[PDB]
Each structure stands twice: as structure tokens, then as C-alpha cells.
Recover the amino acids of this structure.
């Protein structure tokens, strides 16, 4: 279990826009952002956001047991800091094309 | 670390030998020829 | 990968027991064995009840 | 860098390294850390002195209250329209439970244009008595959200001739939704608002001007402190 | 660089088991519980309130008590003769005792009136063995032998009766 | 598609004039009435194919779990593409493939 | 959020929403208006996110027709308040206040608990109805109940926390009862006797 | 009669597969509905096979009539027999 | 079709409990509350979604 | 045809006092609303080095001190600059940078924060007149602007990441203590005293 407040702070720092400023007609291509099952905002460049969140988690800025999930098909981006999630470790393959 | 929900969005090699592209006693590995390339 | 209908992707074990199974084949074979155990341990009670009603 | 002297030195270092916007060579010297793209134009970031006394609120229409969506209303008020840019809002509250906002605008294009031109050119001490009549249009339900911090939101206005950018504080956000008046309350509705409102432009009184200068003295005391 | 062999993978797995062990989830969950969860549960409803508009000169009196900090100790054993001493799990196993520690809560009382407090023992919580609040966490290999504890024992359980 | 009222945002139900013989969309919450452009009041599809290719996103080329082919793009003639089957998941759904180019990102078939 | 009506049966396919401390189900349009968004177009704006999908609009049409009878926020809240399982005979204003309470709290508590923050609740209701429609129109398979990423494990921590919450509430009630009994005698209780 | 029109487009391939005639469907509708509904049908050679109808506030009434028609118009066959298969049986004679 | 149902409401004139009967006619959109002891009759319009609690609340509002 | 509800024609002769503006927008009455991030603060007050030096606060919590240091060094400020000709001029430490692509960036010192602009319709700025209870419009808020750090290597982003990572690391509520006696001794001794005074009170009441 981890607090979700730093996650929300990081998301709001990197261009996430709240629900009160959201129009579904205007945002026909934005990604819904969920944090612990709560729809908290939207974003229009999910790739940079997920890259930044994953890099921060890999550097220790975010707790390693935080889940970062991007559903491209449903246009959703989910984050979980809940308690009770079963995880396992894996090696990381350098997937950067420019590297 | 990855949990079961995040596993649905990743692509996992089984062994580090799988990252790079006729004996009757050695086991046979999957070809995985459906895709031209794997990342 | 997604949308794979090849035999190895959907549970065909091409090795023998002497040759040795790969981890994917091992997991699929374990799934099938679990099916067998559940089926036996679930149908036993229905069979016993049918036998009792027939006897009575 | 917990030393207060170090923090002060960092502040003066940041103050001294400001690039002159007219210095094209130094502007081209600056490079984006990630984009690797040279700079084109620059503007100074300054606060606004004449507007700190007033109170500013960000007003938004929620849902069907959009003026663009209401096609007959937009056609009546003009397809930027000076009538929209010079509209008046009159909050009236009968009781805590019942509340709404009254909207007024200038139907005539010439009168609205003259009023907007007169209002946007106030730099002298001579104001013509523009007796402009405002007509009621529609009423909306309102909700208000307050900002815990003073400068939570700020709107930026630009000035190309001076190469500056003036920002103003935002106190709160007002949201409006379309309100359908109950047929059983139209008798009381007719006694609340008015069909017309006349606005008269007059020079501000000396006492009110002194009060506003005293309010502005918190920000700028060099040019506005009383003697 | 050089390629990564299977022996390198087993070195990484050995590092994992050197850091975590096999019962790390139990101990970590219990430590989280004892460290924060008890305090949060106490602060969930931190104010009991009793009011009495006495008229017997109207005096509206409110009586309210606040819950403060949680204090924990190492497990202790209290004998029939009245003495106390530090308890260890082997003694609890041999004498059919419960390996538990007292919990203390700060209660503050205030007497509100309008005309118009120290540590209280709230119970004993059983301690999970080899956790941060167990006596065997610190003991090294030699004192563990002197305490009749097996060094291969991993903890992660409680001793009730 | 159905239109909404321009003054109170409710649904515009169709209405027929007995005297004028015209199809009009009228809001039942007011007296607003707008002239209908088409006589297609209602249409029901017993067998439908919508949603088969409608499930497409512009960032589908960044998914690493999707297979990659070398089929020829009809527009820009690229040599890399990403394919997948039908997003509709009924029992009658075909097993045909939809290919997405990595430059123009359009959906095209192989037939 | 149940979807009543079988395929080609039961006339219209109405969508009724079950609410806590409410004896009978409620159509989605009435509760949507109760939250404070009356126009039907904006209800469809909240629910659907692509206007060209005529099928979901057709499926929402019976709900709009059923909810057309209610057209104001306050009558919607009153309708919520009649069925709220409270004591019979409560006045209209108190019923409306009870509906406001049962709507602000206990309706999606994980989102928020404060007043005037119901926009997120309306957006989440639209999201739930959208998911229900997407599954109902055979566009997606029903959720896998046996998926392991949707499960959680409770270790010693959470179990002991739940147990301690129950026991501490019992101890607090005992302290309350002893305090009530002791105030009869009017004594400066030690407070080390109330605690058991 | 009423200005409301009801026309339904039928799949040519499955209609030919079941070996059915448009006149047969028209007679079935006429029998079940007597003269309460006027019916017309496009011929065989039409590009799209269609059959219209006209009644003799009634939009909802026409919708209910269309739903009832789609539901319980039996062209031919034994009710209850959903599908039929052909099987070969090896018999010793 | 008139529907007659026995209700556990309390009359505000006779104070006797369990003596209130709700009679609603959906065809004419009307609802009648009759007291088995007081013999008083209360009439209020009803809608398609009406329930006896609606007429009871309407009677409560009318009484005050 | 929705007839106009208001036809009384009653009119108020209210006159509003208006002050001259130090600046006037040219060509368009457009303004951009910008949300204030946690790492950025606005100091409208003129920069006074001696009170600023005398009011630096030091806390035991390293994370709070680091956050205060970051927001203080990143705070938008301004001060009076004495010109070489003897005049006084307003000098600021913040600038706006526009790149070749047309995007805008807010610059304070060496730190650069990118701007993401989203078009907003029917959004305007108004001025509140509380003494008359009416709202006077000012201009139109066409675009909403969010401030985003330029890159990972920026010092502001690294300090924010460090502060947020070490903020959730410190978690210790329960405080240890040493028990020297039986915890139930107080309960039994007070029960004994209460039973004694109950007996005394019962005897007194029977004797009263
Ligand atoms: Zn209308
Ligand atoms: Zn292409
Ligand atoms: Zn009675």
C-alpha cells in the first residue's frame, strides 16, 4: 500500500486536466486517467505521460509496487497503489528505438 | 515489478537467449513465426 | 503476441515426456491436469446421490 | 544550499541573467533543452498595477448554457461581438435556497461599439456621458468555488509594443447552467429583475479614487503612497 | 559488455532471497499494521461526545474525550506474585502463555460549559515472531542459541496459549 | 441521428400536421418546432456490421503485443504494418484481418 | 445499475439504478437530474462520447421517454426521498434534505465526500452506463470474474485491522455506556475504570 | 389511411436459400392482417428486394405493428423445429 | 383500473393507526385516500410511476 | 415563439466609476488562463533582499525545507532597478519564450517550463463590483494554459521527484515505551478504592 497523493501531484504537474474542464465533444481523442479506480482527469498525450511515470518509478521516485497500466484500445490509463496486489519481478529490455 | 493486470500490456521473452534470433534428445522451442519481428 | 492461433500458442505439446516440456507447455499441461482433478472430485457426489436414489 | 546568503545569491543570480528581448543574438543563443529549437520572440512577465484593486473571477458556462449552442440567442446578439464583450451580470438572491444571475447586453451594434471603444480608450481624465441602455436576455443558475490561495489562477495579457505580459489574479470560478423558470413563480420573477438598465459613465470620485489607491499601495508603494 | 548467463540469473535470484527471505510478506504486513494501522483506527473516531442541557439557570454542558497517541512495548509476563519480566517465545511455548504486548492510549478529557489524562491500557496485542516488535529481531546467532531458538526458524506466526 | 432543441436542449420528437401534411421535429417541453429535412423517422438493422472496424485508435502502432507483418500499404507503400482481427466479439464474427500502416495509420483489408 | 428488459420482450429496455438506503430501483434519468443536470442532451453528453453511434442512443431512448415525466431537480430529489426507507410521514423539505444526504454520501463514497463536488459523480455515472451499454451491445465480452489481476490478498495486517476496528468500536461503546451511567452519580471519574 | 410508411429490406441471399417467393410472404401478411394494412412488394428483378406497407399519433402504433410482424410471422415449417439436418444411416437389409 | 390497497399510514384527524386505504385509478390518473374511521377522502393526481407513498406524501403536504 | 417574460420597462439610473488602465490590449481582447503548479509561486510584492534574508525559515524536516527552497528560488518576483540615467524602472526575473513551432514557454532564471494550450469556448473574465453587487466583464479567456517541466534533467523536476519520493518514506506513528509494572494494576487498585467508597457511601446513606 502506498499513498496516492504524490501520484496525483505528478500527474497534475505533467499536463493532466481535471474533469470540470472536460467536454466529451471536444475531447474525442483524449485518454481517461484513473487512479485507484477513480476517474480523476484526462490527457491528450498519453505516451509522454506513461513514459515519464515509468521512468520515475524505475528511478525510485515512485514506489516500485505501484501499477502503471496503459490500455491503448479503450483509451484508458490506470494507476493502482492499493494494498493486496500480487506481483513478480522481471528483467527490463531496453526498448528505446533511439538507443 | 509487474502485477497480473499490468502483465496484459507487456511482451515477455522466456529466456535471454530468445532476445536474439536436429537432435533427438533435446527439447524443441516454439518458432513464433506469426510476426516478422518481435520487440 | 495478440491474435495467435498457431498450435503452440493454444496448448499443443510437441515434445515427449522423455524430451522434456517447455514452460508454456508445462503450464498448459498443468491446466489440463487441474481440469481432470476438479472433474473427478466434483462428479463423485452427483454419482453417489444417483446411486442412493436408485438403490432406495 | 540551506544558507540564507546562498538563497539570496541565487535570487540575485536569477535576476541578473534576464535576456533582453531586443537582443536578437542573445535570444538566438538560448536553446530548448529537449526540443533543441532556437527562440524567436520574447516578452517580459510583469504584474498589473491598475487592476489589483478590482476583483476578478473566471466566469464559464456549463453545458447547454453555451452561447454558440444557443443559435437564436447568438443570432439576436450578433454572430468578437462587442455586445458579448460589454455584457453586464447582476446577481440577485431572494433567499439562500433560490439564486440566479441576470444577464444584460446591448442589442444595437453601434451603441455597443461606441461603448467598447470609449471603455478601451480610457487613458485621460475626460469621459463622455454615454447613457447606454442594457436589455435583459436570459437567466442562469450559478455555483461558486473559492480558491484557497490568492494567485491560484492568473490570466495573461500581452503587449507587443512594450514586449511585456501583464497578469491579473483570479479570486474564484463561477459556473452557469440553464435554468427553467417554474410557471408557478413567474409572478415573483417579474418583480425581481428589470426589462432595461441604464449605464451612465462618470468620472470617479476623489474619495473612491483615494480608497482604490490605498488598496493598490500594498502592491506598489513607490508611486501610490499617500503623502 | 558481455552476455548474461544462467548463472548470473541464479546470482540475481540469490540476491533476492538474501534480501527478502521467504516469509517477508507476513512480517511486512504485520509491521505495517503495528506501525500505522492501530493509530489510524484510533483516529478514525477520535472524539466521544456527551451533552447535558442541565436545567435544575440554563447551563449547556458538553463532555468530550479525545484519543491521542498509541504507545507499544516489548512483550512482558506478569506472574502471580506480582513481579514482571521480559518474555521470550520459548518460555511462552513451554508454559502455554500468549506472546503479546500491552497497548497504551492517551485519553484527554475536557469539560465544556456554555450558559445560554494519561496513558490508559486498552489491551494486549499478540506479536508475530521475528517482526520489528519481537524480541528475537535483534538477537544475533549466539544469543539465539542461548535462548533455545532455532536459527533456521523463520517466524511469521503467533504463539497463543 | 436525432437532433436536440435549440432553446431548452431536450429531444426533438417528430410530429405530423393534419392540415399542412408536413413532418416536423417538435420539443414537448415548449412550443419550438423545426422543419424536418428527411422522412427517415426510424431504421432498425436486424443484422449489422457497425463496430467491426469502428474500434480503431490512432495510437495502435505503439502497442508492443500486436503482431507485425510486411504487407504492402495501399496508400504510401510502406513495408511495415500491424494487423489484428475484428474488434466485434459476437459468435458470428468473421476471422478477417485489419492491417494498420505505421505512417498513414489507415485500416485496410487484404481482399 | 441493472438493465431491465429481455431482447424483443418487455417493451422498452429501461435502465434502472439501485441506490443504497432506497427500497426500489430508480431510472438513470431521474437520478441524473437529481445530481443536478436536467437537460436530456447533456445527460447523453455525459453517457455517450461519440454522437454517430445511433445504437446506444436508441437503447437510451426508452430511459429518456420514461424519465420525461420528471423535469426539475427538486422534484427528482423528492422522488428519491420518498423511497429512502426512512420513517413514514417525514415532511417534503426534510425528505429533500435526506435525499441530498444519501446522494452526497454513500453514493460512490470512494470518489468524494464533500458538497458541490457531484460533477465527478455524474461523469462516473456516465462511465458506468457507457460500460453497461458497451457490454450489452455485444461490443465487448463480459468481465472475467476469475482474472487474477482483479483479485486482492489480505495478509495479517488488514485482517487484524478489521478485527481491531470491531473490538475498538465495542470498547468505545462500553466507555460511552459507563460514562452515561456515571454522570448520574456526578463524579470526577478516573477514566482508568471505563476502559476494559 | 395514414401518411406513415413502413418498408423493410430483406436479404436476397437468405431468402433464395430458404426457397421462398415474395408473393407467398405477401399472402401471409394479407391473411394475418386482413385489409387493415395495404401491402405492396417489389418484383424479383429488383436490385434490392423490398416490400412496403401502409396503415389504413400513430408512429408508436406502427412501431409496435412492425415489432409484432418481425416477431411472429411464420412463413412455413413446423413451429418448434428450429433447425433440420440431413443424416445418412447405414442399415442392414 | 382502480387499485385498492391497505396501508399502515396514520390519520391526522382521528389519530388511529393502520386505518388508511389508498385507492388509485391509473386510467383517470387519480388517487384516493380514505380513512376507515374518519371517512375523509383526499384526492390528488397521479402519474405513470405513482406509488401509494407518492399520494401519502401529497396528503402530508396538503395537510400542512 | 417564447414570449419575453419581462416587459415592465423599469430602469435603474446606476453610474459606475471606472479608472484608467495602465495597458490596453491590441487587436484582440484575448487572455490565457494559467493554472499555478505546486513548484511555482507568484510574489507580486517588490523584491526586498534584507527582509527576504531575515525571513528564511529552517525546519528539521528535510523534505519541507527542500520544497520551500525550490519554490522560493522558482518564485516569480520583480524589483525596482535604478537606471544609469537616474530614473527608476521595473525589472522582473521572468520571461516568455516562443519557439519556432509557435509554442510558448515560461522562463524563470535558467528554468524553462513548457505551455500546453487548450481552446475553451464561452469562457470570459469579469470584474466584481461588490459595493453595487454586479459583475462587469473584462475580456475573453480563449485558451487554458498548463505549465509542464521541460525535461527530466531540469533541477526543478529532480527536486520535486526527490521531495515526493522521500516524503512517503517517513512513516512512524506509534512510539515505543517500557513497561515496568503490571498494566492492570491501576484498574484493580481503582476498583478497590471505588468498592471501599461504595461501602462507605452505603453505610453513610443507611446512617443518614
Ligand atoms: Zn424545447
Ligand atoms: Zn501507409
Ligand atoms: Zn381518521
Amino acid at each position: 500500500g502506498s499513498p496516492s497523493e504524490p501520484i496525483i501531484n505528478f500527474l497534475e504537474e505533467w499536463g493532466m486536466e481535471p474533469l470540470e474542464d472536460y467536454d466529451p465533444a471536444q475531447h474525442t481523442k483524449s485518454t481517461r486517467i484513473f487512479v485507484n479506480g477513480v476517474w480523476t482527469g484526462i490527457h491528450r498525450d498519453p505516451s509522454m505521460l506513461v513514459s515519464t511515470m515509468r521512468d520515475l518509478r524505475r528511478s525510485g521516485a515512485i514506489s516500485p509496487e505501484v501499477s502503471i497500466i496503459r490500455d491503448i484500445r479503450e483509451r484508458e490509463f490506470k494507476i493502482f497503489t492499493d494494498v493486496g496486489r500480487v506481483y513478480r519481478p522481471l528483467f527490463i529490455v531496453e526498448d528505446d528505438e533511439s538507443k | 515489478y509487474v502485477d497480473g493486470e499490468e502483465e496484459e500490456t507487456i511482451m515477455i521473452a522466456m529466456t535471454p537467449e530468445d532476445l536474439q534470433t536436429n537432435d533427438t534428445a533435446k527439447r524443441i522451442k516454439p518458432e513464433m513465426s506469426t510476426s516478422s519481428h518481435h520487440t | 503476441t495478440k491474435d495467435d492461433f498457431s498450435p503452440e500458442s493454444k496448448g499443443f505439446v510437441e515434445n515427449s515426456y522423455l524430451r522434456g516440456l517447455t514452460p508454456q507447455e508445462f503450464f498448459f499441461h498443468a491446466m489440463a491436469g487441474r481440469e481432470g482433478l476438479i472433474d473427478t472430485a466434483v462428479k463423485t457426489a452427483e454419482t453417489g446421490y444417483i446411486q442412493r436414489r436408485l438403490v432406495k | 544550499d540551506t544558507n540564507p546568503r546562498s538563497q539570496l545569491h541565487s535570487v540575485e543570480r536569477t535576476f541578473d541573467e534576464v535576456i533582453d528581448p531586443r537582443n536578437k543574438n542573445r535570444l538566438q543563443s538560448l536553446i530548448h533543452p529537449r526540443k533543441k529549437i532556437k527562440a524567436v520572440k520574447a516578452w517580459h512577465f510583469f504584474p498589473d498595477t491598475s487592476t489589483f484593486d478590482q476583483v476578478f473571477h473566471s466566469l464559464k458556462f456549463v453545458g447547454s448554457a453555451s452561447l454558440s449552442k444557443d443559435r437564436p440567442l447568438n443570432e439576436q446578439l450578433g454572430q468578437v461581438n462587442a455586445s458579448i464583450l460589454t455584457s453586464l451580470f447582476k446577481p440577485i438572491e431572494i433567499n439562500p435556497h433560490n439564486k440566479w444571475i441576470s444577464l444584460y447586453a446591448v442589442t444595437d451594434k453601434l451603441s455597443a461599439e461606441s461603448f467598447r471603444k470609449s471603455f478601451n480608450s480610457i487613458k485621460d481624465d475626460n469621459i463622455v456621458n454615454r447613457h447606454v441602455i442594457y436589455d435583459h436576455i436570459k437567466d442562469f443558475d450559478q455555483m461558486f468555488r473559492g480558491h484557497k490561495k490568492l494567485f491560484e489562477d492568473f490570466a495573461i495579457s500581452f503587449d507587443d509594443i512594450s514586449d511585456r505580459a501583464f497578469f491579473v489574479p483570479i479570486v474564484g470560478r463561477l459556473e452557469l447552467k440553464k435554468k427553467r423558470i417554474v410557471p408557478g413563480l413567474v409572478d415573483m420573477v417579474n418583480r425581481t429583475n428589470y426589462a432595461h438598465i441604464r449605464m451612465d459613465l462618470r468620472n470617479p470620485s476623489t474619495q473612491e479614487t483615494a480608497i482604490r489607491d490605498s488598496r493598490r499601495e500594498q502592491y506598489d508603494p513607490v508611486n501610490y503612497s499617500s503623502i | 559488455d558481455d552476455t548474461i548467463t544462467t548463472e548470473d540469473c541464479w546470482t540475481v535470484i540469490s540476491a533476492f532471497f538474501e534480501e527478502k527471505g521467504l516469509v517477508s510478506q507476513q512480517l511486512d504486513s504485520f509491521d505495517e499494521f503495528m506501525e500505522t494501522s492501530i493509530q489510524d483506527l484510533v483516529w478514525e473516531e477520535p472524539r466521544l461526545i456527551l451533552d447535558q442541557p442541565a436545567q435544575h439557570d440554563n447551563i449547556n454542558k458538553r463532555y468530550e474525550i479525545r484519543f491521542g497517541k498509541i504507545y507499544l512495548s516489548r512483550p512482558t509476563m506478569t506472574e502471580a506474585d506480582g513481579t514482571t519480566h521480559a518474555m521470550f517465545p520459548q518460555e511462552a511455548r513451554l508454559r502455554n502463555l500468549t506472546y503479546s504486548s500491552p497497548v497504551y492510549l492517551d485519553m484527554e478529557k475536557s469539560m465544556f460549559t456554555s450558559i445560554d489524562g494519561n496513558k490508559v491500557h486498552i489491551g494486549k496485542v499478540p506479536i508475530m515472531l521475528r517482526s520489528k516488535f519481537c524480541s528475537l529481531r535483534t538477537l544475533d546467532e549466539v544469543d539465539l542459541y542461548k535462548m533455545k531458538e532455532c536459527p533456521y526458524d523463520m517466524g511469521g506466526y503467533f504463539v497463543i496459549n | 441521428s436525432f437532433r436536440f432543441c435549440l432553446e431548452c436542449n431536450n429531444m426533438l420528437y417528430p410530429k405530423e400536421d393534419k392540415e399542412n401534411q408536413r413532418l416536423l421535429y417538435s420539443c414537448r417541453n415548449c412550443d419550438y418546432t423545426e422543419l424536418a429535412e428527411d422522412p427517415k423517422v426510424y431504421r432498425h438493422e436486424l443484422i449489422t456490421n457497425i463496430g467491426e472496424t469502428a474500434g480503431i485508435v490512432d495510437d495502435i502502432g505503439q502497442d508492443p503485443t500486436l503482431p507485425r507483418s510486411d504487407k504492402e500499404c495501399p496508400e504510401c507503400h510502406s513495408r511495415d504494418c500491424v494487423f489484428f482481427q475484428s474488434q466485434q466479439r459476437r459468435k458470428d464474427t468473421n476471422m478477417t484481418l485489419f492491417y494498420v500502416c505505421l505512417n498513414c495509420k489507415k485500416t485496410f483489408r487484404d481482399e | 445499475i441493472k438493465l431491465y428488459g429481455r431482447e424483443d420482450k418487455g417493451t422498452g429496455r429501461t435502465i434502472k439504478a439501485t441506490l443504497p438506503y432506497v427500497k426500489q430501483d430508480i431510472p438513470i434519468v431521474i437520478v441524473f437530474r437529481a445530481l443536478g443536470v436536467v437537460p436530456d442532451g447533456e445527460i447523453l453528453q455525459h453517457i455517450c462520447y461519440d454522437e454517430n453511434d445511433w445504437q446506444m442512443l436508441e437503447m437510451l431512448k426508452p430511459c429518456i421517454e420514461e424519465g420525461f415525466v420528471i423535469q426539475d431537480k427538486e422534484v427528482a430529489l423528492d422522488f428519491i426521498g420518498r423511497r429512502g426507507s426512512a420513517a413514514l410521514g417525514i415532511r417534503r423539505e426534510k425528505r429533500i434534505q435526506y435525499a441530498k444526504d444519501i446522494l452526497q454520501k454513500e453514493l460512490l463514497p470512494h470518489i468524494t465526500q464533500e458538497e458541490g463536488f457531484e460533477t465527478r459523480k455524474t461523469f462516473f455515472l456516465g462511465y458506468m452506463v457507457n460500460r453497461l451499454l458497451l457490454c450489452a451491445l455485444e461490443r465487448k465480452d463480459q468481465d472475467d470474474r476469475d482474472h487474477f489481476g482483479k483479485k486482492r490478498l489480505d495478509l495479517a495486517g488488514p485482517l487484524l485491522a478489521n478485527l481491531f476496528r470491531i473490538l475498538f468500536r465495542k470498547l468505545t461503546r462500553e466507555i460511552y455506556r459507563y460514562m452515561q451511567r456515571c454522570i448520574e452519580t456526578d463524579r470526577d471519574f478516573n477514566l482508568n475504570l471505563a476502559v476494559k | 389511411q395514414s401518411p406513415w410508411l413502413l418498408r423493410l429490406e430483406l436479404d436476397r441471399a437468405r431468402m433464395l436459400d430458404k426457397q421462398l417467393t415474395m408473393n407467398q410472404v405477401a399472402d401471409k401478411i394479407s391473411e394475418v392482417f386482413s385489409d387493415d394494412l395495404f401491402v405492396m412488394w417489389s418484383e424479383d428483378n429488383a436490385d434490392k428486394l423490398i416490400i412496403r406497407c401502409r396503415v389504413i399519433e400513430e408512429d408508436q402504433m406502427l412501431k409496435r405493428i412492425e415489432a409484432h410482424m418481425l416477431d411472429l410471422i411464420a412463413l412455413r415449417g413446423i413451429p418448434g423445429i428450429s433447425k433440420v439436418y440431413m443424416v445418412k444411416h447405414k442399415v442392414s437389409v | 383500473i382502480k387499485q385498492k390497497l391497505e396501508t399502515q399510514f396514520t390519520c391526522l384527524f382521528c389519530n388511529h393507526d393502520n386505518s388508511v386505504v389508498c385507492t388509485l385509478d391509473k386510467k383517470n390518473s387519480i388517487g384516493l385516500l380514505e380513512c376507515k374511521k374518519c371517512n375523509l377522502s383526499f384526492q390528488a393526481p397521479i402519474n405513470s410511476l405513482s406509488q401509494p407513498i407518492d399520494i401519502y406524501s401529497d396528503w402530508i403536504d396538503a395537510c400542512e | 415563439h417564447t414570449k419575453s417574460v419581462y416587459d415592465n420597462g423599469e430602469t435603474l439610473d446606476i453610474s459606475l466609476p471606472i479608472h484608467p488602465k495602465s495597458h490596453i490590449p491590441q487587436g484582440k481582447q484575448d487572455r490565457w488562463v494559467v493554472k499555478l503548479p505546486d513548484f511555482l509561486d507568484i510574489n507580486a510584492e517588490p523584491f526586498d533582499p534584507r527582509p527576504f534574508e531575515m525571513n528564511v525559515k529552517t525546519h528539521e524536516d528535510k523534505n519541507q525545507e527542500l520544497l520551500d527552497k525550490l519554490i522560493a528560488v522558482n518564485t516569480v518576483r520583480w524589483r525596482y532597478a535604478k537606471s544609469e540615467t537616474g530614473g527608476i524602472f521595473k525589472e522582473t526575473n521572468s520571461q516568455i519564450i516562443q519557439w519556432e513551432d509557435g509554442t510558448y514557454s515560461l522562463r524563470v532564471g535558467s528554468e524553462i517550463f513548457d505551455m500546453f494550450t487548450t481552446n475553451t469556448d464561452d469562457n470570459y473574465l469579469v470584474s466584481e463590483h461588490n459595493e453595487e453587487g454586479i459583475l462587469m466583464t473584462e475580456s475573453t479567456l480563449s485558451k487554458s494554459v498548463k505549465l509542464v517541466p521541460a525535461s527530466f534533467q531540469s533541477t526543478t523536476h529532480q527536486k520535486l521527484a526527490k521531495a515526493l519520493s522521500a516524503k512517503q518514506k517517513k512513516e512512524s506513528y506509534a512510539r515505543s515505551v517500557v513497561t515496568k509494572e503490571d498494566p492492570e494494576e491501576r484498574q484493580r487498585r481503582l476498583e478497590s478504592q471505588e468498592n471501599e467508597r461504595y461501602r462507605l457511601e452505603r453505610r453513610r446513606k443507611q446512617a443518614e
Summary: Chain C has one helix and no strands.
